[PDB]
Amino acid sequence: KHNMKAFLDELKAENIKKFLYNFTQIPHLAGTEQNFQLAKQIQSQWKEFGLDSVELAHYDVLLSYPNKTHPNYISIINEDGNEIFNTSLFEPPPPGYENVSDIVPPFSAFSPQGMPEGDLVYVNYARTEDFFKLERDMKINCSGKIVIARYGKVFRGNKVKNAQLAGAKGVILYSDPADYFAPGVKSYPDGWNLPGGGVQRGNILNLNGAGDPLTPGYPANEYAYRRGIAEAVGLPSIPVHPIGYYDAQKLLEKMGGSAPPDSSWRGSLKVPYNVGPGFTGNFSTQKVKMHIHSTNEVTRIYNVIGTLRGAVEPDRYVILGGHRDSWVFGGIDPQSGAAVVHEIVRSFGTLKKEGWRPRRTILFASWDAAEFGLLGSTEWAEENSRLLQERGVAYINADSSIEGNYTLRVDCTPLMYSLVHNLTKELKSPDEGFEGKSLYESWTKKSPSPEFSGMPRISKLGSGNDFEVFFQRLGIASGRARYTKNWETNKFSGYPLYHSVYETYELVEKFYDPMFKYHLTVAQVRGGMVFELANSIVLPFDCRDYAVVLRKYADKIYSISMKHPQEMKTYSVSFDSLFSAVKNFTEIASKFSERLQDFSNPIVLRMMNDQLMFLERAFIDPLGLPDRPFYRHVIYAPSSHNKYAGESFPGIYDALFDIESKVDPSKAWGEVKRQIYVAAFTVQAAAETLSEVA
Amino acid sequence: KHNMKAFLDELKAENIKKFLYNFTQIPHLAGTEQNFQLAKQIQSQWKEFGLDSVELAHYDVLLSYPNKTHPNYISIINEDGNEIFNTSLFEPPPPGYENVSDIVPPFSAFSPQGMPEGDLVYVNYARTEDFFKLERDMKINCSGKIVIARYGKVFRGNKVKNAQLAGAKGVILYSDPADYFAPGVKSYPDGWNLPGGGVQRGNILNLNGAGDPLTPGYPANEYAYRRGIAEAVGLPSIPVHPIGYYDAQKLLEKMGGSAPPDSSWRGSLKVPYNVGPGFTGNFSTQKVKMHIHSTNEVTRIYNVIGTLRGAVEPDRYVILGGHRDSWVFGGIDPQSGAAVVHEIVRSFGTLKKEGWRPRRTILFASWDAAEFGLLGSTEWAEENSRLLQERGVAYINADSSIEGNYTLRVDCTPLMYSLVHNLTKELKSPDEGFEGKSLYESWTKKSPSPEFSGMPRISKLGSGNDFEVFFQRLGIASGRARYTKNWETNKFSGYPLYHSVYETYELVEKFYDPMFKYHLTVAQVRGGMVFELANSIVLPFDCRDYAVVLRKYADKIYSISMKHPQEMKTYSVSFDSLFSAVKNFTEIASKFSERLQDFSNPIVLRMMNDQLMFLERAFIDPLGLPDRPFYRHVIYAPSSHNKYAGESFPGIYDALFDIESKVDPSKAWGEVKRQIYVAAFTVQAAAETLSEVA
Ligand SMILES: *[C@@H]1O[C@H](CO)[C@@H](O[C@@H]2O[C@H](CO)[C@@H](O[C@@H]3O[C@H](CO)[C@@H](O)[C@H](O[C@H]4O[C@H](CO)[C@@H](O)[C@H](O)[C@@H]4O)[C@@H]3O)[C@H](O)[C@H]2NC(C)=O)[C@H](O)[C@H]1NC(C)=O
Ligand SMILES: *[C@@H]1O[C@H](CO)[C@@H](O[C@@H]2O[C@H](CO)[C@@H](O[C@@H]3O[C@H](CO)[C@@H](O)[C@H](O[C@H]4O[C@H](CO)[C@@H](O)[C@H](O)[C@@H]4O)[C@@H]3O)[C@H](O)[C@H]2NC(C)=O)[C@H](O)[C@H]1NC(C)=O
Ligand SMILES: *[C@@H]1O[C@H](CO)[C@@H](O[C@@H]2O[C@H](CO)[C@@H](O)[C@H](O)[C@H]2NC(C)=O)[C@H](O)[C@H]1NC(C)=O
Ligand SMILES: *[C@@H]1O[C@H](CO)[C@@H](O[C@@H]2O[C@H](CO)[C@@H](O)[C@H](O)[C@H]2NC(C)=O)[C@H](O)[C@H]1NC(C)=O
Ligand SMILES: *[C@@H]1O[C@H](CO)[C@@H](O[C@@H]2O[C@H](CO)[C@@H](O)[C@H](O)[C@H]2NC(C)=O)[C@H](O)[C@H]1NC(C)=O
Ligand SMILES: *[C@@H]1O[C@H](CO)[C@@H](O[C@@H]2O[C@H](CO)[C@@H](O)[C@H](O)[C@H]2NC(C)=O)[C@H](O)[C@H]1NC(C)=O
Ligand SMILES: *[C@@H]1O[C@H](CO)[C@@H](O[C@@H]2O[C@H](CO)[C@@H](O)[C@H](O)[C@H]2NC(C)=O)[C@H](O)[C@H]1NC(C)=O
Ligand SMILES: *[C@@H]1O[C@H](CO)[C@@H](O[C@@H]2O[C@H](CO)[C@@H](O)[C@H](O)[C@H]2NC(C)=O)[C@H](O)[C@H]1NC(C)=O
Ligand SMILES: *[C@@H]1O[C@H](CO)[C@@H](O)[C@H](O)[C@H]1NC(C)=O
Ligand SMILES: *[C@@H]1O[C@H](CO)[C@@H](O)[C@H](O)[C@H]1NC(C)=O
Ligand SMILES: *[C@@H]1O[C@H](CO)[C@@H](O)[C@H](O)[C@H]1NC(C)=O
Ligand SMILES: *[C@@H]1O[C@H](CO)[C@@H](O)[C@H](O)[C@H]1NC(C)=O
Ligand SMILES: *[C@@H]1O[C@H](CO)[C@@H](O)[C@H](O)[C@H]1NC(C)=O
Ligand SMILES: *[C@@H]1O[C@H](CO)[C@@H](O)[C@H](O)[C@H]1NC(C)=O
Ligand SMILES: [Ca+2]
Ligand SMILES: [Ca+2]
Ligand SMILES: [Cl-]
Ligand SMILES: [Cl-]
Ligand SMILES: [Zn+2]
Ligand SMILES: [Zn+2]
Ligand SMILES: [Zn+2]
Ligand SMILES: [Zn+2]
């Protein structure tokens, strides 16, 4: 038979290993010739594997690169203006590379140019609450200071936005061993820890879903009209540069002014972690000076788009997508995902060559420029938004398949919870100690649900990856899965060698997944999801699972508001409409489920499949969230404080955030009430899409 | 058989006459008890006629009413402050009414309160070009003046916006006999002309599609959060009041200052039509003083919504809608349309009682508060936007069935051109001299297409009626048809007794349509359209007709730009992308049509029916047009200078309008190029929805 088992058994760990090696021998930086060549290779292989068509979709978007003849670096500068200490111009290459060319040196993509000098202030993780503590509790003023922040906890672009609004004139990001050196394991090449010369690259934009900074709303095609740089979306206004912890030690060791307010501000280096401003007495006249010369430039990028046409519903699309561009070799990010996608295409293509076709169309995508702000997926979605909105069933993401070797991680819409639970019950656990047990069993034991006994944890989708445009802009049911670590407090910090030159094929083969069994497990989960979505007669979504979580989020947002009972009294702030809506959604979703179970009629079926497909769509508000027009889902948006994290009822959440500090409480609470109304209405409207149609 | 002929033959002129009489005995002003009672009556009758369900959908929206104990009026005031002339407090009621209560006196709905006094300036029709002529050519300044304008040519809200931006402190609107008294016919009650005491009511908002001024984007339901009055959408900032031509004569007769610039500024009254400012020498110290005391108030309105469930595709909606509220008796506006809808429901219900059901669901609507800014249709569409966007096939409007007795008038999307031509070829002409000939034949002879021999004229949809939210906001194929006059230059001015107390059942039965044959003809056209849309196996849309008009509009907008060849050279303004897109649309639409003709497969059919249904949808831009977020169709929007008129390529049109006057030509031409890009992209994207799906 040609069934899911046939598809799944065809997948091989050894093939994933071979493709990973193949994709990680040279850098594949977005906008470079090396990455165009890999695009053309993937296009050629996907054709050979059997897909019906495979095309390149290209766009010309704003990218950012260091100046090769004018290196970025940071100095401590004495009173005479002599640079007495300079940060590194590059990371020491790992063994056997040392002669690889075109390794981009560490930089913060999209930093403007500048040479600011000033006194340092240390701002911990540069989170919203870190700046609150500095400004409000310690009365330290960052205006005209250079801030130095440790990576971790939140997306780096949020750090830079927060530094900017505090009045900083520059930001230095660094990797502290507290967050990037796991106790008892050795530095690369002899283990998976970050060495002191290692540095994490990454962009520092605040695009809020816009895609290419110059063309928000529309694809960056050949005739595109572009904003001027001063009106571009999301660009930082102050210079920014990342360094490793050997260099950070030299900048922090001399710091004076106030002590750290408490131990949550202290990293692992042998320094006081004083907040500053400036250095201790003997060095008080020394300053820090940044030298940033990177340039932004419009550059062509290439997505590879493969189609496997559906036999019965060719106008319904199930999309498996992940990016191809990397900062350097991309041994984990993204090639551990891209290799998994390659093997999934190969397995589907094997079935196709034997005469099989899935019920619905499957689209496979190799996105470009994800590292520069999800630009490739976003421009493509902007180009095809009408097709996706009326035909998009689901999007499964496929960035890195591993970030640890402990257990499964799934983040997805509630509509896919039942699909995930069911599929994982049918897959074998790859974990030591769980041989002959299901993946569901190992996952649930290692990552228990906080809410339910005998269930695994599944997180909300945030952002920082290519499902953002499909889920938060277009309202297409989306999910992602990978193997992960057991380091709760580091969830959003990245694995130690994240976006460093040390992220190589050897890292994976030696330390993370020698037998490629975790990669295989993830290929089974992602591929199994795609298979069921593209083949099940009734779409494998359960609207009742959304009803359950909506009630959880409504309790949560009500609890936040109830921290302010006097104001809720004064301004008559009622959550009654939102709970009413959630109750109705629960009642209607229950009845719809009964009909779906109780209904030979392909019209009723497809009518019902359309109701299932358009349910995620119904949570979209065409007016968007306040000042973030591309985050249109009313239930989920990326946290305004941390792009990686999802926030539920974001419009109400942001209206309540720090409300006790607002100067006009009447206005602020009026906006809370407005967002309650919008949320209650959207939940009720979504519920009504599940009612009988006439 | 139960076919279109059965449906059409069941329609009777005599029934339309009886319903019209029934709907026009008392006023049915929005928000009044009389109009709620008629809603409940229609709900009851539609149930009796056979519909599956009939419900009231109610909303609480901002309405506007005179103060009953503090009448609105205008004075000429002498130097002492004595009011030596007062305009009327009411229109002389027509014969047999004179004891009807609750006739709302003439007023401009949504006028703010005020008692401004000043000198008059006469501004012709208060069009954009009239103000250009005054300010630019005659150097007359309206700042702090009261402007007096004649009704006609453009929507009254555009007049008031234009007066406001000219700095007027008040606006007086009046009906000139030149525009509202046809030569050789008598005044009401002895003919269909406007008497000197008659006055045209109407709202003066500039909502640009927003619906209820207090809740843009969301339905005005029970828990709605409302803007404060100062942030409401579309409200005028200066007092406004309408008068008849006996009163206008008294205000204009004393006018001094400059002569009219030319004869296009002269109406038919026996006055000089001097522009002012102020009165001639002897009266120079007299002023004009307005007294406006109307109030805005949130008031419940009721839509009646009837459903006839589809037998095969119940989740596809074909909507026939028209409003029920009137300014006074509504003998033409809207009851001549509402009576036609009532008889259509009765005829469909007759077929249903004999066991028939249409293929798709038909929804019938009796909208409320249309006179106060299309509020009932818009709030309902805001509430149901997700259902309409994913299921809406078409909307056929049904306001007044007559505005003359000369020939047919149709305004619709290009997708319905072929449907209209075909249906009209099968219907009998009601016209004298065309007995035994088709409606197509009489219509084409009396209203020839400007472009094509042997074809009738069909206009673009503008606005000023309840299809606005469905077409320009949601992108649902829409159309309208009625019998019309032969008075080209008056097309947007209204028939003489428009929105006056004289618009009665007697007006229609005696002067417009004694035999109710034109009403019957219109019931056949509107009902026949609904029938074909709800019953044809393949939706009766022809995408090739859109290709033809797109090329016409692209030539037109290019010709406008080419008035500025030096600037197109300087700023490299190319229309090449737009023509390319139109060429591609033409090519793809031709191939799609071949497949639609060449394709027993209900999936392919419905796939193809979805491509047809979503084609109008594809012209929607979710970001809207500049500063008009609710006008989202990129091909058509209501003219920024006249809400009644449709404009094609509106975003490019407005970017080019008066561009020679802009202070920064680089910026202005940059915005023209931006709008070219948006248009080319949207046309290409729409074309791509007709490509093979995979
Ligand atoms: C969840 O679904 C339920 C339906 O099962 C839905 O119930 C609806 O609630 C609204 C608002 O509560 C009801 O609205 C009432 O409608 C009646 C006419 O049917 C009106 O007379 C009422 O207005 C009077 O009372 C108001 C409240 O005191 C006054 O403010 C007002 O001035 C009037 O005096 C009121 O409009 C509606 O009838 C029911 N519909 C039903 C039962 O079918 C509920 O709204 C859904 N939740 C959400 C968030 O949508
Ligand atoms: C109407 O449909 C046609 C398809 O039938 C579609 O044609 C496409 O036009 C674009 C833009 O003209 C072509 O884009 C080119 O793509 C090639 C690779 O395929 C690139 O190498 C080209 O870039 C070079 O040349 C440019 C122009 O001089 C330079 O600006 C650039 O820097 C590069 O040097 C260019 O991107 C595209 O290939 C075709 N696609 C086809 C033929 O299938 C057309 O765009 C449609 N119209 C609209 C308005 O969409
Ligand atoms: C990655 O694998 C690809 C595909 O096998 C290799 O590309 C092929 O290489 C051979 C030898 O040069 C050529 O003859 C083929 O035409 C190439 N096929 C393509 C591009 O489709 C490539 O060599 C491998 N790269 C590495 C670093 O191992
Ligand atoms: C840090 O780098 C700077 C820049 O290369 C060094 O300063 C330069 O040194 C050369 C040779 O002495 C001078 O001629 C340049 O004019 C200096 N450029 C400057 C100050 O911008 C500096 O010596 C380096 N510092 C250390 C500790 O190595
Ligand atoms: C996950 O599997 C469960 C158990 O098989 C599925 O639930 C069953 O579905 C069938 C078909 O509708 C029903 O007859 C059973 O009563 C259901 N059992 C339950 C709810 O306990 C469930 O549908 C699957 N989820 C998917 C496919 O998304
Ligand atoms: C318009 O027609 C309606 C429906 O025939 C009339 O309302 C009915 O009137 C009779 C007499 O009062 C009642 O017994 C019915 O219950 C009413 N039916 C309804 C409201 O559904 C109404 O009288 C007519 N109005 C005018 C002015 O002729
Ligand atoms: C126009 O109407 C105004 C208001 O009714 C009239 O002026 C009023 O006349 C009465 C009786 O003489 C006075 O007591 C009021 O105080 C006046 N009110 C004002 C000036 O606001 C005026 O007489 C009317 N003019 C004409 C020509 O009939
Ligand atoms: C209007 O009627 C014309 C003439 O009948 C229809 O065009 C014909 O459609 C049939 C079925 O596709 C074709 O076989 C003929 O070749 C067409 N004749 C032509 C184009 O001259 C047309 O489809 C009708 N329009 C509708 C129903 O919207
Ligand atoms: C790189 O270095 C210097 C900076 O002035 C100069 O040679 C060249 O313009 C730079 N390249 C850029 C800005 O892309
Ligand atoms: C922070 O410092 C700068 C000093 O130039 C000043 O302009 C700003 O107002 C200060 N803010 C506070 C709250 O002290
Ligand atoms: C893999 O798992 C083992 C066993 O828990 C652990 O000691 C090792 O550090 C893990 N490797 C990585 C990279 O997490
Ligand atoms: C109507 O007339 C007067 C205006 O002051 C007053 O009796 C009453 O408040 C008014 N009604 C309103 C404003 O609705
Ligand atoms: C129009 O008149 C007013 C007089 O108060 C003045 O403020 C305004 O600037 C004038 N504009 C022109 C163009 O004369
Ligand atoms: C109806 O038609 C006749 C004949 O052309 C015309 O004289 C009459 O004025 C028309 N009535 C109306 C109200 O247009
Ligand atoms: Ca873009
Ligand atoms: Ca509203
Ligand atoms: Cl992922
Ligand atoms: Cl109409
Ligand atoms: Zn990645
Ligand atoms: Zn990355
Ligand atoms: Zn009307
Ligand atoms: Zn009207």
PDB file of N, CA and C in Angstrom, chain B residues 499-517:
ATOM      1  N   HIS B 499     -35.836  62.944  -2.036  1.00  0.00           N
ATOM      2  CA  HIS B 499     -35.668  63.166  -0.552  1.00  0.00           C
ATOM      3  C   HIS B 499     -36.547  64.347  -0.023  1.00  0.00           C
ATOM      4  N   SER B 500     -37.606  64.606  -0.774  1.00  0.00           N
ATOM      5  CA  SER B 500     -38.588  65.593  -0.356  1.00  0.00           C
ATOM      6  C   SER B 500     -39.923  64.889   0.202  1.00  0.00           C
ATOM      7  N   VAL B 501     -40.734  65.663   0.913  1.00  0.00           N
ATOM      8  CA  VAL B 501     -41.999  65.142   1.436  1.00  0.00           C
ATOM      9  C   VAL B 501     -42.924  64.746   0.250  1.00  0.00           C
ATOM     10  N   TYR B 502     -42.652  65.262  -0.976  1.00  0.00           N
ATOM     11  CA  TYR B 502     -43.543  65.037  -2.158  1.00  0.00           C
ATOM     12  C   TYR B 502     -43.311  63.668  -2.808  1.00  0.00           C
ATOM     13  N   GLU B 503     -42.280  62.929  -2.329  1.00  0.00           N
ATOM     14  CA  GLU B 503     -42.011  61.607  -2.879  1.00  0.00           C
ATOM     15  C   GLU B 503     -43.003  60.578  -2.282  1.00  0.00           C
ATOM     16  N   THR B 504     -44.152  60.399  -2.941  1.00  0.00           N
ATOM     17  CA  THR B 504     -45.255  59.631  -2.385  1.00  0.00           C
ATOM     18  C   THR B 504     -45.641  58.517  -3.337  1.00  0.00           C
ATOM     19  N   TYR B 505     -46.528  57.649  -2.872  1.00  0.00           N
ATOM     20  CA  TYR B 505     -47.142  56.627  -3.699  1.00  0.00           C
ATOM     21  C   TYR B 505     -47.794  57.287  -4.928  1.00  0.00           C
ATOM     22  N   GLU B 506     -48.426  58.445  -4.690  1.00  0.00           N
ATOM     23  CA  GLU B 506     -49.126  59.129  -5.827  1.00  0.00           C
ATOM     24  C   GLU B 506     -48.190  59.615  -6.908  1.00  0.00           C
ATOM     25  N   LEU B 507     -47.009  60.073  -6.499  1.00  0.00           N
ATOM     26  CA  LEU B 507     -46.013  60.447  -7.447  1.00  0.00           C
ATOM     27  C   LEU B 507     -45.757  59.300  -8.425  1.00  0.00           C
ATOM     28  N   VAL B 508     -45.570  58.091  -7.870  1.00  0.00           N
ATOM     29  CA  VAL B 508     -45.246  56.973  -8.718  1.00  0.00           C
ATOM     30  C   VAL B 508     -46.438  56.547  -9.593  1.00  0.00           C
ATOM     31  N   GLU B 509     -47.586  56.330  -8.962  1.00  0.00           N
ATOM     32  CA  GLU B 509     -48.772  55.790  -9.634  1.00  0.00           C
ATOM     33  C   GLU B 509     -49.309  56.764 -10.689  1.00  0.00           C
ATOM     34  N   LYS B 510     -49.139  58.065 -10.466  1.00  0.00           N
ATOM     35  CA  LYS B 510     -49.688  59.048 -11.432  1.00  0.00           C
ATOM     36  C   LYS B 510     -48.692  59.452 -12.515  1.00  0.00           C
ATOM     37  N   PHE B 511     -47.413  59.608 -12.161  1.00  0.00           N
ATOM     38  CA  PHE B 511     -46.480  60.262 -13.073  1.00  0.00           C
ATOM     39  C   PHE B 511     -45.398  59.322 -13.563  1.00  0.00           C
ATOM     40  N   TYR B 512     -44.868  58.464 -12.689  1.00  0.00           N
ATOM     41  CA  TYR B 512     -43.715  57.669 -13.136  1.00  0.00           C
ATOM     42  C   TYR B 512     -44.088  56.361 -13.819  1.00  0.00           C
ATOM     43  N   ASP B 513     -44.989  55.582 -13.227  1.00  0.00           N
ATOM     44  CA  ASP B 513     -45.222  54.202 -13.693  1.00  0.00           C
ATOM     45  C   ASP B 513     -46.617  53.700 -13.387  1.00  0.00           C
ATOM     46  N   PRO B 514     -47.631  54.320 -14.044  1.00  0.00           N
ATOM     47  CA  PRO B 514     -49.008  53.988 -13.779  1.00  0.00           C
ATOM     48  C   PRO B 514     -49.376  52.532 -13.863  1.00  0.00           C
ATOM     49  N   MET B 515     -48.789  51.810 -14.810  1.00  0.00           N
ATOM     50  CA  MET B 515     -49.129  50.425 -15.024  1.00  0.00           C
ATOM     51  C   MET B 515     -48.157  49.502 -14.271  1.00  0.00           C
ATOM     52  N   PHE B 516     -47.194  50.103 -13.571  1.00  0.00           N
ATOM     53  CA  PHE B 516     -46.173  49.293 -12.848  1.00  0.00           C
ATOM     54  C   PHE B 516     -45.385  48.357 -13.763  1.00  0.00           C
ATOM     55  N   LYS B 517     -45.338  48.699 -15.056  1.00  0.00           N
ATOM     56  CA  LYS B 517     -44.584  47.866 -16.005  1.00  0.00           C
ATOM     57  C   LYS B 517     -43.068  48.071 -15.880  1.00  0.00           C
TER      58      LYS B 517
END
